[PDB]
C-alpha cells in the first residue's frame, strides 16, 4: 500500500514531432543518386488497440517533400548549360510552331553563325518580324541537361532512429481524424513525385470506395482531393517526329535546337476510355453527394495551371481537360484531350531561374494511371439550388498530401515513470 | 512477440514485460553511400538519434540507473500526482494515457529521483569506518 516511483526505459510512448526526414531509393539524378538503399524487407508492425489522430493538412512531411523536390530541381539544373546568349533577336516565319533564324556566338569570340530552330508559339513573343523568347525580359534561362530524366521514380521518406512513422491502415479513413487501425514503419511506401495539375497521375489507389478529402468541404477556398479505387488509364502521345540539332555556341556550350518536323502535323493528345471514366465519374459524384451537381472547366489565365500540366519523356505537356469536365449529374469510345507543349516553364523563375526543356527526338508516348483529381467549388450562390465543380491544380503540395495522407511523424519518449511498491536497497 | 511498439495499446503491465523490444529497436545504423542535400539530411538525422538516446541515458545515470530498463528509487509516490490504485494503473491504462496524466508532474519526479540518489551516494561516502 506504500507506493514509490520506478523508472521504465522503452515505454511505448510517442509524441507528435516535425524532424528532418531523409530519402531512400534502389532502382535518374533526383532519386537514383538519392541516399541509402532501402532495406530488403520493411517491417510494418500493426499496433493492436491503438487509435491515433492524423491530419494530412497540418502535416510537415508535405512541406519537407515540397522543399526537397525544389532543392533537388535546383541542384540538378545548376551544372547544366544556361541559355543566356540565346536571347538574340529572332527572325521568325510560319512553318502554331515557328521557324526562327538568329545569330549566335560561335566558339571563336569574333565569329558569328546564323542558325534556325523550331519554337512552339508559347516560347516566343514579338516586340516591334523580330521576336524574342518570352522569358528573356522576365528572367534568365538554363537548359536542362539531356542525360537527367524527368521521369518520377519512387522515393521513400524515412524517419531517423528514435523516431517513427505512423501509418493509418483504415480503408475508409478520412483525411483527418482518429484512425482505429495503426501500424508503425521506419519508411513510407514508394512515392513517385509526379508533377501534375488537375488530375493526379501514378498515385496510390484507395481500397474499397474512392476517397474525397478536403480541409473543409463547405469552404470553396480549400481544394478537393479525389483518390480512385479503380485506376483509369490515360495514354498520352506527342505524334510529331521531332529532331534534335546540336549547335555549338561556345567552348563546350551546345544548344539543342528543334529540327524540321518529320511526319504528321498533329498535336499531342491523350485518350481515356469513356466507359471506365463514366464509371469513375459516377462513383465520384456518389461520394460527392455523400456531403451534399455539375462539372465545368476552370478558366483562369495561366495555361500551366488551367490545363492538366505534366511531364512525359522529357517534354512538358499542358492538356485541355474540357472533355473530362463537361457534365451534369442527378444520379471503347475513349475521350481524347488536346495537349500543347512548352519547353520554357517558370514554376519558380522569381525564386531562381527558368528551365528550357530540351527537345525530344522522335515520337513521344507514355501510359499513365490516373488515380486522383483536384477540384474546386465556385463562389457560393443561392444555397442548395445547384453546385458546380471546376478542376484545378493550383499547387504541387496537394500531390504530396495526396500520397502522404496516410503517414505521420512521431518522436519516441522512452522515459516512463510509474508507481510500484518498490524501494531500492537501503545503504 | 509483437514487435516495436506492438504493446502500445496494451495494458501498462503487458507492455512493461516487453519494454526491451522498444528500447533495443530505438538505435539503428543505416550505413551509407553518399560519397548533397540528401547527405546533409542523413548526417543531421544521424546526430539527433544518438543525441536523444544519450540524453535519456544521462537521465538514467543521474537517477542511479545507468544499467537501464527497470530500477527502483527511494522516492515515495505523492498522491497528488495520481490518485489511482495499483490495479487500475497497471491493468486499466496504457502507457500513453499514463504519460498524459502524469506529464504535469514529470519533472518534479525527476528532481526527486536525482536528489534521492545524491543523498544515497553521500551516505555511501559516509559509510566506512
Amino acid at each position: 500500500e506504500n507506493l514509490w516511483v520506478t523508472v521504465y526505459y522503452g515505454v511505448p510512448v510517442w509524441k507528435d514531432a516535425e524532424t528532418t526526414l531523409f530519402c531512400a531509393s534502389d532502382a535518374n539524378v533526383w532519386a537514383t543518386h538519392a541516399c541509402v538503399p532501402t532495406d530488403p524487407n520493411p517491417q510494418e508492425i500493426h499496433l493492436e488497440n491503438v487509435t491515433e489522430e492524423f491530419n494530412m493538412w497540418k502535416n510537415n512531411m508535405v512541406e519537407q517533400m515540397h522543399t526537397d523536390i525544389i532543392s533537388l530541381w535546383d541542384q540538378s539544373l545548376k551544372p547544366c548549360v544556361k541559355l543566356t546568349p540565346l536571347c538574340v533577336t529572332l527572325q521568325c516565319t510560319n512553318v502554331e510552331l515557328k521557324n526562327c533564324s538568329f545569330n549566335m556566338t560561335t566558339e571563336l569570340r569574333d565569329k558569328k553563325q546564323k542558325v534556325y530552330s523550331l519554337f512552339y508559339r508559347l516560347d516566343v513573343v514579338q516586340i516591334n518580324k523580330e521576336y524574342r523568347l518570352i522569358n528573356c525580359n522576365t528572367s534568365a534561362i538554363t537548359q536542362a541537361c539531356p542525360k537527367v530524366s524527368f521521369e518520377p521514380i519512387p522515393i521513400h521518406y524515412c524517419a531517423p532512429a528514435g523516431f517513427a512513422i505512423l501509418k493509418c491502415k483504415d480503408k475508409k479513413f478520412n483525411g483527418t481524424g482518429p484512425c482505429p487501425s495503426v501500424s508503425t514503419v521506419q519508411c513510407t511506401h514508394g512515392i513517385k513525385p509526379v508533377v501534375s495539375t488537375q488530375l493526379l497521375l501514378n498515385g496510390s489507389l484507395a481500397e474499397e470506395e474512392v476517397m474525397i478529402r478536403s480541409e473543409n468541404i463547405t469552404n470553396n477556398a480549400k481544394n478537393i482531393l479525389v483518390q480512385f479505387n479503380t485506376p483509369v488509364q490515360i495514354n498520352c502521345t506527342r505524334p510529331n517526329n521531332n529532331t534534335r540539332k546540336s549547335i555549338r555556341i561556345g567552348p563546350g556550350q551546345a544548344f539543342y535546337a528543334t529540327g524540321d518536323i518529320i511526319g504528321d502535323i498533329r498535336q499531342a493528345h491523350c485518350n481515356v476510355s469513356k466507359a471506365t471514366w463514366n464509371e469513375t465519374l459516377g462513383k465520384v459524384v456518389k461520394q460527392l453527394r455523400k456531403h451534399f451537381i455539375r462539372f465545368a472547366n476552370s478558366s483562369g489565365g495561366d495555361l500551366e495551371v488551367t490545363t492538366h500540366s505534366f511531364n512525359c519523356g522529357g517534354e512538358f505537356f499542358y492538356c485541355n481537360t474540357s472533355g473530362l469536365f463537361n457534365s451534369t449529374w442527378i444520379s471503347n469510345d475513349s475521350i481524347t484531350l488536346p495537349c500543347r507543349i512548352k519547353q520554357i516553364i517558370n514554376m519558380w523563375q522569381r525564386i531562381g531561374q527558368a528551365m528550357y526543356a530540351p527537345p525530344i527526338q522522335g515520337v513521344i508516348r507514355c501510359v499513365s494511371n490516373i488515380t486522383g483529381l483536384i477540384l474546386t467549388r465556385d463562389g457560393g450562390s443561392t444555397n442548395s439550388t445547384t453546385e458546380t465543380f471546376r478542376p484545378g491544380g493550383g499547387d504541387m503540395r496537394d500531390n504530396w498530401r495526396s500520397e502522404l495522407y496516410k503517414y505521420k511523424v512521431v518522436k519516441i519518449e522512452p522515459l516512463g515513470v510509474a508507481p510500484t511498491r518498490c524501494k531500492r536497497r537501503v545503504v | 512477440f509483437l514487435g516495436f511498439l506492438g504493446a502500445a495499446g496494451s495494458t501498462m503491465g503487458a507492455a512493461s514485460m516487453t519494454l526491451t523490444v522498444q528500447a533495443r529497436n530505438l538505435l539503428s545504423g543505416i550505413v551509407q553511400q553518399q560519397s548533397t542535400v540528401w547527405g546533409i539530411k542523413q548526417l543531421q538525422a544521424r546526430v539527433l538519434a544518438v543525441e536523444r538516446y544519450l540524453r535519456d541515458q544521462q537521465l538514467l545515470g543521474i537517477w542511479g540507473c545507468s544499467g537501464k530498463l527497470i530500477c527502483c528509487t527511494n522516492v515515495p509516490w505523492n498522491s497528488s500526482w495520481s490518485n489511482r490504485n495499483l490495479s487500475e494503473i497497471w491493468d486499466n491504462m496504457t502507457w500513453l494515457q499514463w504519460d498524459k496524466e502524469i506529464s504535469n508532474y514529470t519533472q518534479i519526479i525527476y528532481g526527486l529521483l536525482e536528489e534521492s540518489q545524491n543523498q544515497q551516494e553521500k551516505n555511501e561516502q559516509d559509510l566506512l569506518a
Partner: nanobody
Framework: GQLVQSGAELKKPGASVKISCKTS????????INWIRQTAGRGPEWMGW????????????????RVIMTTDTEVPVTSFTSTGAAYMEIRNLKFDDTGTYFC????????????????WGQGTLLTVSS
C-alpha cells in the same frame, strides 16, 4: 463515460424485444459489455457478457437459447474514448421476464475480474403483459 440504454418497451408474452446500449466517454472496444436483469420475484440475475473487441460471448445457461447479444464496431471520438452500441434481443417472453435490464462496462483491461460489471447504464424497463 456514459452508457445510455434504450428507453422502455411493452411486449406481449411469446413475443421478442431488442434493447440497445449506446456507449460513450471510454474506449468501447476495450471493456466487456455485460447484460444483467432485475425482477421483483427472483431478484438480480446475471445474463451474460460480450466482448466488443473479439466478439466472444459468455451466456448464462438459463439464457443461452433465447438471448442474442451483439455489438457494433467502435466509432472513434478522440483516441482514448469512443462511442459504440450493443444490443440484446430476448425472445419467448413470459410474465416472470418482466423487469429492468442493464448493460454494464467491465472493470479492468486485465486481471482477475476483467468482465466484472463496473460502469452501469440507466436501465431499460421491459413489461410482458396482455
Amino acid at each position: 463515460g456514459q452508457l445510455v440504454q434504450s428507453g422502455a418497451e411493452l411486449k406481449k408474452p411469446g413475443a421478442s424485444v431488442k434493447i440497445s446500449c449506446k456507449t460513450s466517454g471510454y474506449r468501447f472496444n476495450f471493456y466487456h459489455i455485460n447484460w444483467i436483469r432485475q425482477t421483483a420475484g427472483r431478484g438480480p440475475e446475471w445474463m451474460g457478457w460480450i466482448s466488443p473487441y473479439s466478439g466472444d460471448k459468455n451466456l448464462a445457461p438459463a439464457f443461452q437459447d433465447r438471448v442474442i447479444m451483439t455489438t457494433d464496431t467502435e466509432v472513434p471520438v478522440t483516441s482514448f474514448t469512443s462511442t459504440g452500441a450493443a444490443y440484446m434481443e430476448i425472445r419467448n417472453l413470459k410474465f416472470d421476464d418482466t423487469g429492468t435490464y442493464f448493460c454494464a462496462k467491465g472493470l479492468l483491461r486485465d486481471g482477475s475480474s476483467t468482465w466484472l460489471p463496473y460502469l452501469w447504464g440507466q436501465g431499460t424497463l421491459l413489461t410482458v403483459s396482455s
